[PDB]
Short mmCIF file of C-alpha atoms in Angstrom, two decimals:
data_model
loop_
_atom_site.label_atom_id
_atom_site.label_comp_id
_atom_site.label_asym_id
_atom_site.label_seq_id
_atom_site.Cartn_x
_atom_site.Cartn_y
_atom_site.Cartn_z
CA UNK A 1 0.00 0.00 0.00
CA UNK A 2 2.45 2.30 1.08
CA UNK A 3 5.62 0.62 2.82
CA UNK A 4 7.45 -0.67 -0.17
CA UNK A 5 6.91 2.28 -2.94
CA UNK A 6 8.07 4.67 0.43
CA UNK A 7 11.08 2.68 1.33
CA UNK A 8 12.07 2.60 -2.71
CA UNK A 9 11.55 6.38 -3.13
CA UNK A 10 14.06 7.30 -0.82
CA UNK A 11 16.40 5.20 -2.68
CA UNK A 12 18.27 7.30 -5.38
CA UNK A 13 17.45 6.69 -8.88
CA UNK A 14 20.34 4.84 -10.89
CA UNK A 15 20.93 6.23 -14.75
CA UNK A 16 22.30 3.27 -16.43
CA UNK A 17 25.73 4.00 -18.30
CA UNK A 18 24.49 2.88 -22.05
CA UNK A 19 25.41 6.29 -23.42
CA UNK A 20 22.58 6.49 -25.98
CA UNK A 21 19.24 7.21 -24.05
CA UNK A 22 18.05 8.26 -20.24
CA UNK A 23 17.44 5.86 -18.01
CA UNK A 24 15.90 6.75 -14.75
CA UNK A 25 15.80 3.26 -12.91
CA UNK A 26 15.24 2.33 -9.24
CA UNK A 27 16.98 -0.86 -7.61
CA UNK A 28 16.65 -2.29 -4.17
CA UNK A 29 16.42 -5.61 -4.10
CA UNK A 30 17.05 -6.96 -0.09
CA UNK A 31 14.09 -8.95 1.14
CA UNK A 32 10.28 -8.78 0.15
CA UNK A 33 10.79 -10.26 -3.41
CA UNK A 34 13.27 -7.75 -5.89
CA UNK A 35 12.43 -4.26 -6.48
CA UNK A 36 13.25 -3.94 -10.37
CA UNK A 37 12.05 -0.55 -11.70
CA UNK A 38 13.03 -0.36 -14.73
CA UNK A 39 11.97 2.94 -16.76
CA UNK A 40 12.65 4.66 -19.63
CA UNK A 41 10.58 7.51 -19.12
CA UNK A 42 7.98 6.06 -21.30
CA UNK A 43 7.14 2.77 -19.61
CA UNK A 44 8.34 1.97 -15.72
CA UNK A 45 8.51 -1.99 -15.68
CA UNK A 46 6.75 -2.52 -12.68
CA UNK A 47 8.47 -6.00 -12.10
CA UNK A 48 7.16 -6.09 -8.49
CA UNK A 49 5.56 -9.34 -9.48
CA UNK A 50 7.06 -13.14 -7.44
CA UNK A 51 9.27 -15.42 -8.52
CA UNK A 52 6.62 -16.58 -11.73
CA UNK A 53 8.66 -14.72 -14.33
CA UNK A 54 12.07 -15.04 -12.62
CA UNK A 55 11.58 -19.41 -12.47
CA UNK A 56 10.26 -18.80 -16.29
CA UNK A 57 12.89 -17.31 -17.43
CA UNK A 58 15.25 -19.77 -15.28
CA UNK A 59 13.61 -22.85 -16.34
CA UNK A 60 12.72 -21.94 -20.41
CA UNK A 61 16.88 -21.40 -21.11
CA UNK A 62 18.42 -23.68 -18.13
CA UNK A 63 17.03 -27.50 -18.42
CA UNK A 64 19.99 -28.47 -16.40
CA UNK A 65 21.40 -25.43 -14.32
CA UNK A 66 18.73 -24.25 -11.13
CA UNK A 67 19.94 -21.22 -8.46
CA UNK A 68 17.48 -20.84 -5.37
CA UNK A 69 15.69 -17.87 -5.44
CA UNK A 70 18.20 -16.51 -2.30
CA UNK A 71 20.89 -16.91 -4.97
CA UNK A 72 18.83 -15.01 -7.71
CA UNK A 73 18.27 -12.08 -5.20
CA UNK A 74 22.07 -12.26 -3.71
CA UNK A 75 23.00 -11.67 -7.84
CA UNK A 76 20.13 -8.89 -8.16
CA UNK A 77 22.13 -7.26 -4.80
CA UNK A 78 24.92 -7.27 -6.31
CA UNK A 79 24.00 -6.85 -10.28
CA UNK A 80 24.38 -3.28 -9.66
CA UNK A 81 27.20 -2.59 -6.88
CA UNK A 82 30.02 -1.71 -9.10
CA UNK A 83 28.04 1.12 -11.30
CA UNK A 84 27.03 3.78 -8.75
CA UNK A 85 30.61 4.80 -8.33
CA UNK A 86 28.74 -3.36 -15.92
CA UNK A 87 24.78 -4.59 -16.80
CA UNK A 88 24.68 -2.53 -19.91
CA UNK A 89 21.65 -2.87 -21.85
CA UNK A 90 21.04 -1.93 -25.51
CA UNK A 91 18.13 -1.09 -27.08
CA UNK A 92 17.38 -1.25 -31.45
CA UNK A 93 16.19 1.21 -34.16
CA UNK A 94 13.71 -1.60 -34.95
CA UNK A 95 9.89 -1.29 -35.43
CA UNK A 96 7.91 -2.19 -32.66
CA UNK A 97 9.07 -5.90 -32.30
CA UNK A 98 11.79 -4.92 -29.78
CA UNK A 99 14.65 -7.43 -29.65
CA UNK A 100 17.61 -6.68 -27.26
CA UNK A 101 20.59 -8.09 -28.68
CA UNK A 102 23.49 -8.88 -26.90
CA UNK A 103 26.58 -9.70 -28.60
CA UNK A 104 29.58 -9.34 -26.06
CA UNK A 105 32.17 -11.96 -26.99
CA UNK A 106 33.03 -14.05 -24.08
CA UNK A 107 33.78 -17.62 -25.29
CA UNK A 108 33.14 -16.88 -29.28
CA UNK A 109 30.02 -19.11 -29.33
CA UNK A 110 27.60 -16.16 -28.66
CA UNK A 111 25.12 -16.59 -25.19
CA UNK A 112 20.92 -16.14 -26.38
CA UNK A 113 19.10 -14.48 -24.18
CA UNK A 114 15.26 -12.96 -24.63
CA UNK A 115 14.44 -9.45 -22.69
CA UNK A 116 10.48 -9.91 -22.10
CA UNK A 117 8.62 -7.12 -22.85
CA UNK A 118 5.22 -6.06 -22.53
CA UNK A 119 2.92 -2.40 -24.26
CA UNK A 120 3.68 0.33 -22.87
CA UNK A 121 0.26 1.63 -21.09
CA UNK A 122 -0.57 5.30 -22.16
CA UNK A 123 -2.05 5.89 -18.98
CA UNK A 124 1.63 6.05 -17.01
CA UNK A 125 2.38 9.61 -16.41
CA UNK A 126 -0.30 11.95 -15.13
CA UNK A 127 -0.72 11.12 -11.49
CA UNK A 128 1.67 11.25 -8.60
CA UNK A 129 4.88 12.11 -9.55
CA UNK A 130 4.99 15.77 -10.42
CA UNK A 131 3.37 16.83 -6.93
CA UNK A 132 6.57 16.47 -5.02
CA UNK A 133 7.75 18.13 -8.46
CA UNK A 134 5.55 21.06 -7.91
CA UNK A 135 6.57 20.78 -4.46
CA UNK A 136 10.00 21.48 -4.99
CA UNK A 137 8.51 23.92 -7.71
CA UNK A 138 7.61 26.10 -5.11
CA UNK A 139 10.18 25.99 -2.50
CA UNK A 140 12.09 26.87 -5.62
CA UNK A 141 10.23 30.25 -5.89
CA UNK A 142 10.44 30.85 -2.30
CA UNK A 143 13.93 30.77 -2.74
CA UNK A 144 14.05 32.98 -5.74
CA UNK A 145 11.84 35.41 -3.52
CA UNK A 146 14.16 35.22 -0.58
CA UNK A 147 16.91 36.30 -2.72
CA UNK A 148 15.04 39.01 -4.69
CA UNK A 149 14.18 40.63 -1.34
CA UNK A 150 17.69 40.37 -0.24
CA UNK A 151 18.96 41.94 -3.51
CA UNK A 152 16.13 44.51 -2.54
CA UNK A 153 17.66 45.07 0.74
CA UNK A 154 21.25 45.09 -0.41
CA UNK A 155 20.29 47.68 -3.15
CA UNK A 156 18.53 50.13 -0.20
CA UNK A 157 21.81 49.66 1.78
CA UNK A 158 23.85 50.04 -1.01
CA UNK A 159 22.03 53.64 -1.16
CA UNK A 160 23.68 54.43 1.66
CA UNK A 161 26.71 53.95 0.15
CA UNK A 162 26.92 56.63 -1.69
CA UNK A 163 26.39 59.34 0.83
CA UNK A 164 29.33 57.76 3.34
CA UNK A 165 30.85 55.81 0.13
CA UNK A 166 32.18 57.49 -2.83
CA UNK A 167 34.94 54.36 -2.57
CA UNK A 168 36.79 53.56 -5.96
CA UNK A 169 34.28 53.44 -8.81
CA UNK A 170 34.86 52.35 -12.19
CA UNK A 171 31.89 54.34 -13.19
CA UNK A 172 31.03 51.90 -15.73
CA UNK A 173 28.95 49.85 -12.46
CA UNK A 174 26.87 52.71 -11.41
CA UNK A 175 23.26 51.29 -9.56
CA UNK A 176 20.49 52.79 -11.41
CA UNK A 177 17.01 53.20 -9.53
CA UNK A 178 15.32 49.76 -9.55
CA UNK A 179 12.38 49.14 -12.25
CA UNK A 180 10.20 46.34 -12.18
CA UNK A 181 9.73 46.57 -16.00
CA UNK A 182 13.60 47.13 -16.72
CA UNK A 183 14.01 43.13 -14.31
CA UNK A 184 11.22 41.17 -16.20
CA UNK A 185 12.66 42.19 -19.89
CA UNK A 186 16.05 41.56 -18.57
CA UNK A 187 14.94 38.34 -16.80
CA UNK A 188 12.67 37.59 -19.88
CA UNK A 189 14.26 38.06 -23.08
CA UNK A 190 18.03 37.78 -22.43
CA UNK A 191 18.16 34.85 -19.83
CA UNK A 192 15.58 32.79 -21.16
CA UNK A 193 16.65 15.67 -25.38
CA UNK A 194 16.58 14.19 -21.74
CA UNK A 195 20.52 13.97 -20.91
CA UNK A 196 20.80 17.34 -19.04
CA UNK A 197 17.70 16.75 -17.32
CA UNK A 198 18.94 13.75 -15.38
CA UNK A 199 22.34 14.79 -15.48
CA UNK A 200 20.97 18.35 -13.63
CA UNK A 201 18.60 16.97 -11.19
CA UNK A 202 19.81 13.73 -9.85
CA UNK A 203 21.58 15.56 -7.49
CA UNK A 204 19.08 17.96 -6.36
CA UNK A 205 15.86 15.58 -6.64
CA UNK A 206 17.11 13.64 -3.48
CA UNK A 207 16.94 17.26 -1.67
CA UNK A 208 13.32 17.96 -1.00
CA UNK A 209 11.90 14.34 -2.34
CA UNK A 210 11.54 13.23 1.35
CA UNK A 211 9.86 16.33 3.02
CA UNK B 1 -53.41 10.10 -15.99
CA UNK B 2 -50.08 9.13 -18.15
CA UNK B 3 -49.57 13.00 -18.78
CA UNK B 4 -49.95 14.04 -15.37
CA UNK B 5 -47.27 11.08 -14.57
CA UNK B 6 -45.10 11.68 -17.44
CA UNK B 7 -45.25 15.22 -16.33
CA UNK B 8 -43.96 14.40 -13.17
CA UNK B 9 -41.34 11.62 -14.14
CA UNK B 10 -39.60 13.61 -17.09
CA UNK B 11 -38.87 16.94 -16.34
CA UNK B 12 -38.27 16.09 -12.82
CA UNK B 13 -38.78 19.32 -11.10
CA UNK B 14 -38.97 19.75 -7.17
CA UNK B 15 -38.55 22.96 -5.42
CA UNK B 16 -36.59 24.24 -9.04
CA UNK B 17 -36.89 27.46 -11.28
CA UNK B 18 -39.54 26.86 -13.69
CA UNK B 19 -42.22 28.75 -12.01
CA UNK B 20 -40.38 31.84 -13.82
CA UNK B 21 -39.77 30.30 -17.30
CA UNK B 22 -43.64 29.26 -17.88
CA UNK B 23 -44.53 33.08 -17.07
CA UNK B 24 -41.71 34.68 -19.29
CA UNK B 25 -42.25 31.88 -21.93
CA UNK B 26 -45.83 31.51 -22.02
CA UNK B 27 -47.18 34.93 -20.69
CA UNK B 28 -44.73 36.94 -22.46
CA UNK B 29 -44.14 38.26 -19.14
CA UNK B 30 -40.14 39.50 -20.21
CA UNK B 31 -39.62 42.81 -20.68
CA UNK B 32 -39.80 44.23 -24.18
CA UNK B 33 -36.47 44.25 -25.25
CA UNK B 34 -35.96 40.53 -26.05
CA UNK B 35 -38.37 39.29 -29.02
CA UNK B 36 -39.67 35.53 -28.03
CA UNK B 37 -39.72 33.42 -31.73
CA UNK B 38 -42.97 31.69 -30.53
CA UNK B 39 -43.60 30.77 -33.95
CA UNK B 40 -46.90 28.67 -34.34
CA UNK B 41 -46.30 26.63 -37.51
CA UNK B 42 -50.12 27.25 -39.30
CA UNK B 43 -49.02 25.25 -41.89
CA UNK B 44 -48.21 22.12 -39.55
CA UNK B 45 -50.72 22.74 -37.20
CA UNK B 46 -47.95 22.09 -34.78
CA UNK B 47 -46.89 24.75 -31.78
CA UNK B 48 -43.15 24.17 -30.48
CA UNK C 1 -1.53 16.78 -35.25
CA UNK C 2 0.70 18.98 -33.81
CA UNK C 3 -1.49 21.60 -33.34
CA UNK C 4 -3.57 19.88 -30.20
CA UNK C 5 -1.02 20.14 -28.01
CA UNK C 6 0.67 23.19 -29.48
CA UNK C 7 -2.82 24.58 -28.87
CA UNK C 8 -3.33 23.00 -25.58
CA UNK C 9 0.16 23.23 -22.86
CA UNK C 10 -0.34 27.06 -23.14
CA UNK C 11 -3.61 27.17 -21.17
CA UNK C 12 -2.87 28.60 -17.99
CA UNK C 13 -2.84 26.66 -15.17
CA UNK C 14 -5.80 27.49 -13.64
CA UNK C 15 -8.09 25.31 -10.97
CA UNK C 16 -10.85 24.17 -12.25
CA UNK C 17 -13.88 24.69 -9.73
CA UNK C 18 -14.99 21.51 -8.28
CA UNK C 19 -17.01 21.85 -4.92
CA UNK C 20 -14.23 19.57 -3.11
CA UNK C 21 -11.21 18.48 -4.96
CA UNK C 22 -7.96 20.75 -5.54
CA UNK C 23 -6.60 18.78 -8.69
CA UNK C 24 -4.40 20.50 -11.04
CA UNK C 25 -6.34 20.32 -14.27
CA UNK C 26 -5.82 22.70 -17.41
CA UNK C 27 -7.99 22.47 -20.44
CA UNK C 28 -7.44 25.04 -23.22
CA UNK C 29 -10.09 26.48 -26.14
CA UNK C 30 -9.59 24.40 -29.14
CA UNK C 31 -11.52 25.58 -32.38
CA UNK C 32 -11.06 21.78 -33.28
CA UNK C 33 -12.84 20.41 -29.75
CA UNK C 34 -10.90 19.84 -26.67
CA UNK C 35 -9.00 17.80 -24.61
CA UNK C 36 -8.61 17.51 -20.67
CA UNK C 37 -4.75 17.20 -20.49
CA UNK C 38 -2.66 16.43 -17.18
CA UNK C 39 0.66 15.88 -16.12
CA UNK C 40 1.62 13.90 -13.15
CA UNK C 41 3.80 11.15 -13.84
CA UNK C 42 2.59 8.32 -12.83
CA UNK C 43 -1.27 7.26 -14.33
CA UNK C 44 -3.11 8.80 -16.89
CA UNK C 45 -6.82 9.51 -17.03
CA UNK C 46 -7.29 11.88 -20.30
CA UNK C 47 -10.78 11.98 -22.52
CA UNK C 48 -9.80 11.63 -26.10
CA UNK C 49 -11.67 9.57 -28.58
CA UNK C 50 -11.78 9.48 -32.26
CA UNK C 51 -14.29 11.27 -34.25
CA UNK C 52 -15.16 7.92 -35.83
CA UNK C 53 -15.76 6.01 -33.13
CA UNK C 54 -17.79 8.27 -31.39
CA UNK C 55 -19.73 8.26 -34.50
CA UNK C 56 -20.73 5.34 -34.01
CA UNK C 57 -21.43 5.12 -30.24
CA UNK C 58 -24.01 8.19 -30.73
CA UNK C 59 -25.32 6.87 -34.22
CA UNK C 60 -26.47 3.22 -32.55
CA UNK C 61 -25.10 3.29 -28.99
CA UNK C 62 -25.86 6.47 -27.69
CA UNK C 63 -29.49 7.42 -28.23
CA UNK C 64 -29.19 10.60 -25.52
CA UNK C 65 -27.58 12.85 -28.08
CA UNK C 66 -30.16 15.42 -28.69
CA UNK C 67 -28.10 17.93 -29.39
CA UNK C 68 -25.46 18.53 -32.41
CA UNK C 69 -22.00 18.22 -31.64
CA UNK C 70 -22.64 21.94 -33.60
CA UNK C 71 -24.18 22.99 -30.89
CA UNK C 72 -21.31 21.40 -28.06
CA UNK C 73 -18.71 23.44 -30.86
CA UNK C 74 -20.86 26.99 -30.28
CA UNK C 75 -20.65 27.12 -26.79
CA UNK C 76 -16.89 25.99 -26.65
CA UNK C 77 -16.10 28.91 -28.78
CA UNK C 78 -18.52 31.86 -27.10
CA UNK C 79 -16.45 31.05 -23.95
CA UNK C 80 -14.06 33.89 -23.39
CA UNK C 81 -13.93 34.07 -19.59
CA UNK C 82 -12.10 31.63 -17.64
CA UNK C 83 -13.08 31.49 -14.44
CA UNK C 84 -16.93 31.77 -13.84
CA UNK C 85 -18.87 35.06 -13.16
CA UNK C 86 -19.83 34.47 -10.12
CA UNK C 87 -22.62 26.03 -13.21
CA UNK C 88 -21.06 24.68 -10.14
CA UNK C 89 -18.95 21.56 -11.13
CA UNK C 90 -19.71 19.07 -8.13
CA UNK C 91 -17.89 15.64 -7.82
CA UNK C 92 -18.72 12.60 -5.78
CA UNK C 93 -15.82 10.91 -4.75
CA UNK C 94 -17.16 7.85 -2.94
CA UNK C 95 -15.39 5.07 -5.22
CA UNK C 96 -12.83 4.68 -7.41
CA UNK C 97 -14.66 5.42 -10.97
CA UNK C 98 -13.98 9.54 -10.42
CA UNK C 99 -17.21 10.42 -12.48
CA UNK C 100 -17.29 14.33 -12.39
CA UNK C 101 -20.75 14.64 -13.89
CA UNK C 102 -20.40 17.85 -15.87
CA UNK C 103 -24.09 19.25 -16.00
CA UNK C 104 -24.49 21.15 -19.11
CA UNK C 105 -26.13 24.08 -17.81
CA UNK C 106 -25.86 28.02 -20.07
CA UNK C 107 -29.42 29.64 -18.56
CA UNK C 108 -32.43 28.08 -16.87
CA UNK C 109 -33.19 24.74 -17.17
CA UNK C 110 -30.05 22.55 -16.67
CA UNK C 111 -29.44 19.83 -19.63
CA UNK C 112 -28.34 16.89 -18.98
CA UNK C 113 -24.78 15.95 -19.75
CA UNK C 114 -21.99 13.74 -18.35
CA UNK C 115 -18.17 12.51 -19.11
CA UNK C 116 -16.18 9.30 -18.79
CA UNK C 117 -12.32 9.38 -18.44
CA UNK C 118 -11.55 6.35 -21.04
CA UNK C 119 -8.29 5.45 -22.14
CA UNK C 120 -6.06 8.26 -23.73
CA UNK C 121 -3.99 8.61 -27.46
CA UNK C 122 -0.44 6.27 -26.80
CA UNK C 123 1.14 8.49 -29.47
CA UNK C 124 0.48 11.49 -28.36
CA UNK C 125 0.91 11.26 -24.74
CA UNK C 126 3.70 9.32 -25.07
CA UNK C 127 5.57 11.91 -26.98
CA UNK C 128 4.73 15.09 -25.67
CA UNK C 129 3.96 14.55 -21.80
CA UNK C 130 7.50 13.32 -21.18
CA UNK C 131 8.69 17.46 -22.12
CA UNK C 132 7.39 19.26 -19.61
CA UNK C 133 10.64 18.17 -17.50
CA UNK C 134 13.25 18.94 -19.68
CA UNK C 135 11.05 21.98 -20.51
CA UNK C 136 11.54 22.72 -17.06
CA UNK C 137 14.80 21.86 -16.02
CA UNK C 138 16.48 23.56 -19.15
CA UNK C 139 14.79 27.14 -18.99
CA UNK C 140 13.72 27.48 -14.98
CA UNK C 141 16.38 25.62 -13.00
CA UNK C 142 18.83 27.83 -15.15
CA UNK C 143 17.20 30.98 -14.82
CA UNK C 144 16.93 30.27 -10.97
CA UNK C 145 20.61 29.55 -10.25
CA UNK C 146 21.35 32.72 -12.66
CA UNK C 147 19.22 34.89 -10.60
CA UNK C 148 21.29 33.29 -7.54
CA UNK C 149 25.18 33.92 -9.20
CA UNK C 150 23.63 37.44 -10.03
CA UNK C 151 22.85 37.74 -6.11
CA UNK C 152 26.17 36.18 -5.65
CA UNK C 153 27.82 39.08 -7.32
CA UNK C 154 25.74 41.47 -5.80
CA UNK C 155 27.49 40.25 -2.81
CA UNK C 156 30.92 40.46 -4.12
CA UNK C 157 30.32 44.09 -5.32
CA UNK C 158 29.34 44.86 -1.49
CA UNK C 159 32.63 43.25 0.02
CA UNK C 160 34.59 44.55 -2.29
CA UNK C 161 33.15 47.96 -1.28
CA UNK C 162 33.64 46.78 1.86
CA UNK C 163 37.22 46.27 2.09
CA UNK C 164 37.35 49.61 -0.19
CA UNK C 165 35.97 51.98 2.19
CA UNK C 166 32.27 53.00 3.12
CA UNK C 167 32.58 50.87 6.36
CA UNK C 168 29.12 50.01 7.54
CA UNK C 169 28.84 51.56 10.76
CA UNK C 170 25.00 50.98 12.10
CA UNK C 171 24.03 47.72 13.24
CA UNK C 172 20.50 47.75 11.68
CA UNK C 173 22.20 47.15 8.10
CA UNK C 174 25.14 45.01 9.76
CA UNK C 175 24.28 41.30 8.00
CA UNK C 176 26.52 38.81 6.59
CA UNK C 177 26.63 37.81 3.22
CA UNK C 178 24.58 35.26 1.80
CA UNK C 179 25.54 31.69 1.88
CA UNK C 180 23.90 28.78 -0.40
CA UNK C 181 25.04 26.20 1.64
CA UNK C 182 24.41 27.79 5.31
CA UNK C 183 20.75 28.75 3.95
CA UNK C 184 19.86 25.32 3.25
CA UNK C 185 20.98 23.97 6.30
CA UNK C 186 19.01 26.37 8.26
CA UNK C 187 15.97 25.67 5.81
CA UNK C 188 16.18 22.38 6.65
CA UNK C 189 16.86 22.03 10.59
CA UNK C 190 15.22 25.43 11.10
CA UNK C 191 12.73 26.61 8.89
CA UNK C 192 11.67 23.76 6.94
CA UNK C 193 8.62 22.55 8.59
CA UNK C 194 7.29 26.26 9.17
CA UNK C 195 8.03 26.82 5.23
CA UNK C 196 5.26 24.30 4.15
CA UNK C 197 2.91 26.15 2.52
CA UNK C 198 0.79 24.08 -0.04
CA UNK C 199 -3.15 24.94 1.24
CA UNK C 200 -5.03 25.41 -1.56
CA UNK C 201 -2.40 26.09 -4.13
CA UNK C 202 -2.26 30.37 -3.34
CA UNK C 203 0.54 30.61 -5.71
CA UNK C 204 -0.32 28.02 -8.58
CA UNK C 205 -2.57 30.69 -9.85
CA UNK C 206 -0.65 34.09 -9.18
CA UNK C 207 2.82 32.90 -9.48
CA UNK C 208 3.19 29.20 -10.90
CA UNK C 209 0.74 29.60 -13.98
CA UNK C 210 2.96 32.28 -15.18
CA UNK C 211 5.94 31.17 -14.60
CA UNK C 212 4.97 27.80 -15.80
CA UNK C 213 3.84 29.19 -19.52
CA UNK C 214 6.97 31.04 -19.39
CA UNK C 215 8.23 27.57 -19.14
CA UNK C 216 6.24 26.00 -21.42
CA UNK C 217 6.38 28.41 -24.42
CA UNK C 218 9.44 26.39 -25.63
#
């Protein structure tokens, strides 16, 4: 209901290093079957499901090699351990029959393996997620008021400094008289894929995404 | 008996605002400044 | 095709009024219909169906269509105010099928109208609802920490005035510079849970909406 999606949230999101799309994946698989969200912002696999698929897929390829399911969970621990400092997956510019290939040489017969996949459900992306977005949203615009009043303040003080100032002046840095119209075209006109995204808010999602 | 139910069962009007609309509709009771296009059809013998 | 949504993300965000619910929920004027779109990320409930189909649930499936879709078209386009006057949108959220019956009412007697949220376009949704974060990140969380180096040089010019001459001398102005890092540790053991002000949404619709089609113009 609520205590595993909770307990995954607070665990950062893991981009995978394929270097050809955005992948904004969570992993934590400890106890309670394996946690493997796997998302690329157009379809989250929500592969919450028990150990049906994993003995399917263990049993269809392996007619003579079985792992326990504490084994299978051990290698889903530790599938991911040295990439948060491989498991590369690559996707196809094929039509909609999407077949992973993997062709890594490692003893030059090549190793088959099949990447289920199901549709994609249009209905995916319009309910929970951009709340704590707006959230942060607007303790971004407090912020940017904060410091708008404090350049406000600073520029009334810095009127003072001209009456007990007159310090060295370039006078090419002189502080006009503030005008509201003169800050919106300036903030307007002037300062106006998915990689910098991710690459610009990994680091600041985990700020306000618990409170 | 069926009109006086199907009165009752279609419109389905308790305690609403049609009190008003039969005197402004039927009694021309509006102001004049809005024409009403009760048109009779004479040729259908048929008053919408 | 590409003109629904072109036509449709620069509707400002503004609530719609529903006697209990605060859901964010834009819908814009379309000459070619209209479309309730939302953003959330994480289910979608959006009404769009195609004209044929339709077709054929009014022609033999619907038999309460007693008014032309002509009609539905005139009063979508005489509808230049946005928020009402003063046709009450009242919900009834007692299970799980949200049906916000949206009574068809323009003057007097009320006519009798209701929606369903069915399944949405894949396409379409798929490919333009995934923007809006990029469309944010790129332009606002830019323009944010560019407003903050701006401040941040505003601060250099003072201590290097400082150190210059023009000593401050009364303690009223005496303050310390501004710190990023010191402000959002005191935000967060300090201030953080006085600072949580979501209510009723105060400034989705003074400060947000604006600042949000600013976002969303590109």
């Amino acid at each position: 209901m609520e205590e595993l999606e909770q307990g995954l949230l607070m665990q950062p999101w893991a981009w995978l290093q394929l270097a050809e799309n955005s992948l904004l994946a969570k992993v934590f698989i400890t106890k309670q079957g394996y946690a493997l969200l796997v998302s690329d912002l157009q379809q989250v696999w929500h592969e919450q499901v028990d150990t049906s698929v994993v003995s399917q897929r263990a049993k269809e390829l392996n007619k003579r090699l079985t792992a326990p399911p504490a084994a299978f969970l051990c290698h889903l621990d530790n599938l991911l351990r040295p990439l948060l400092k491989e498991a590369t997956f690559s996707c196809d510019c094929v039509a909609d029959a999407l077949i992973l290939r993997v062709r890594s040489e490692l003893s030059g017969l090549p190793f088959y393996w099949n990447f289920h996949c199901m549709l994609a459900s249009p209905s995916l992306v319009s309910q929970h997620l951009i709340r704590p977005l707006m959230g942060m949203s607007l303790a971004l615009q407090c912020q940017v008021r904060e410091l708008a009043t404090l350049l406000h303040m600073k520029d009334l003080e810095i009127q003072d400094y001209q009456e007990s100032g007159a310090t060295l002046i370039r006078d090419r840095l002189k502080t006009e008289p503030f005008e509201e119209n003169s800050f919106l075209e300036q903030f307007m006109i002037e300062k106006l894929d998915g990689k910098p995204f991710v690459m610009n808010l990994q680091d600041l999602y985990m700020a306000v995404t618990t409170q | 008996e069926s009109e006086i139910s199907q009165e009752a069962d279609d419109m389905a009007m308790e305690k609403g605002k049609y009190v008003g609309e039969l005197r402004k509709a039927l009694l021309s009771g509006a102001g004049p400044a809005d024409v009403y296009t009760f048109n009779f059809s004479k040729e259908s013998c048929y008053f919408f």
